[PDB]
Amino acid sequence: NSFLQDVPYWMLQNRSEYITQGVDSSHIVDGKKTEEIEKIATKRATIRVAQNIVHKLKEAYLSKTNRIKQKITNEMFIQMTQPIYDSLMNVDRLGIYINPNNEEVFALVRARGFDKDALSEGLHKMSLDNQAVSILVAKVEEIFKDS
Amino acid sequence: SFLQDVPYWMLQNRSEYITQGVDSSHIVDGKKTEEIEKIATKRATIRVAQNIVHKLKEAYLSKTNRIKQKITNEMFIQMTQPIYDSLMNVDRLGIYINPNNEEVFALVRARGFDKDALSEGLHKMSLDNQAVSILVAKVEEIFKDS
Numbered sequence: 106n107s108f109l110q111d112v113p114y115w116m117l118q119n120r121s122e123y124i125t126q127g128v129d130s131s132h133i134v135d136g137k138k139t140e141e142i143e144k145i146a147t148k149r150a151t152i153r154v155a156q157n158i159v160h161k162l163k164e165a166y167l168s169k170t171n172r173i174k175q176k177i178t179n180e181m182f183i184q185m186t187q188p189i190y191d192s193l194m195n196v197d198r199l200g201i202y203i204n205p206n207n208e209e210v211f212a213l214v215r216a217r218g219f220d221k222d223a224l225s226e227g228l229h230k231m232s233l234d235n236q237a238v239s240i241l242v243a244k245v246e247e248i249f250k251d252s
Numbered sequence: 253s254f255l256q257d258v259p260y261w262m263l264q265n266r267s268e269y270i271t272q273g274v275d276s277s278h279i280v281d282g283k284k285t286e287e288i289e290k291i292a293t294k295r296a297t298i299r300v301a302q303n304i305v306h307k308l309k310e311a312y313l314s315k316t317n318r319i320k321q322k323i324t325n326e327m328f329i330q331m332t333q334p335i336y337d338s339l340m341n342v343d344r345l346g347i348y349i350n351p352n353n354e355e356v357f358a359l360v361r362a363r364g365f366d367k368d369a370l371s372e373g374l375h376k377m378s379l380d381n382q383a384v385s386i387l388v389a390k391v392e393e394i395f396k397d398s
C-alpha cells in the first residue's frame with residue numbers, strides 16, 4: 106500500500122476555511138509539458154475559489170435570514186461559478202505539488218480580491234434580478250473582507 | 253515542514269466519497285492516545301454526516317426538488333446529528349499523525365444507515381412526512397451509489 110513523501114501542508118485534509126484559497130489539480134496530457142499542466146492546474150484551483158464562494162452563497166440563501174427574494178436553484182448557483190471566477194482579481198499561485206504515482210499536478214492559489222462591478226454584470230446576465238444581485242455581491246464582498 | 257509517509261486518504265481531493273470522512277483531534281498532555289483516536293474517529297464520522305447533509309441541501313435547492321416544506325440552512329445543520337446517529341457499520345480505516353500540528357487524523361467509512369432511526373430523528377425535528385420520506389430516499393440513494 107501507498108504513502109506519499111515530501112507532501113506540503115496545503116495538500117492535506119484540514120479543518121480550516123480559507124475561502125479565497127483554492128487547491129485543485131490537472132491530470133497530465135500526452136504532448137503537453139509539465140509547465141503547461143501547471144498552468145491548467147492553476148486555473149482549475151482558481152475556479153475552485155469561485156466554487157468555494159458559491160458554496161457559501163448557497164448556505165446564506167438557505168439561511169432563515171436570507172433576504173434574496175428570487176428563487177435560486179442549485180443549477181443557478183452552479184451557473185454563478187463562471188461570473189464569480191471571471192471577477193476574481195490578483196490571484197497568486199502559491200504552490201505546486203505533483204503526485205509521483207499518477208503525475209497529477211496540484212496547485213495552491215489565493216485570490217486577493219474581486220471586481221464587484223464585473224460580478225454584478227455577470228450575475229445580471231444570468232437572469233438574477235437587481236435585489237438578488239445586490240445581496241450576492243455584498244456577500245462576496247464580506248467573504249473577501251473576512252479573509 | 254514537508255510531511256512524510258502520508259497515506260493517500262490524507263490528501264485534499266476526496267469530496268466524491270460521500271460516505272467517507274476524515275477529521276482530527278489534537279494531541280494533549282494528560283489524554284491517552286485512545287481518547288484522542290476516539291475523538292478523531294467521532295469527528296470523522298460527523299464529517300460523513302455533514303457530507304450527506306450537503307447532498308441533501310443541493311437536492312433541495314435543485315429545480316427538481318419535490319420537498320414542499322421550507323427547510324432552512326439551520327434545519328439542515330440540525331439534521332447532522334440524526335444522520336450521524338443513524339449511521340451503521342462505520343469502519344475506522346486509518347489513522348495518521350501530523351507531527352507539525354500534533355493532530356491525529358482518522359479515516360472512517362459508513363457502510364450504511366438505519367432508515368427507520370433516521371426517519372424518527374427527522375420527525376422529531378419537525379420535518380413533515382413528505383420531507384422525511386424524500387430525505388430518507390435520498391440518503392438511501394447515496395448509500396446505493398457508494
Ligand code: NI
Pocket residue numbers: 229
Ligand atoms: Ni440586461
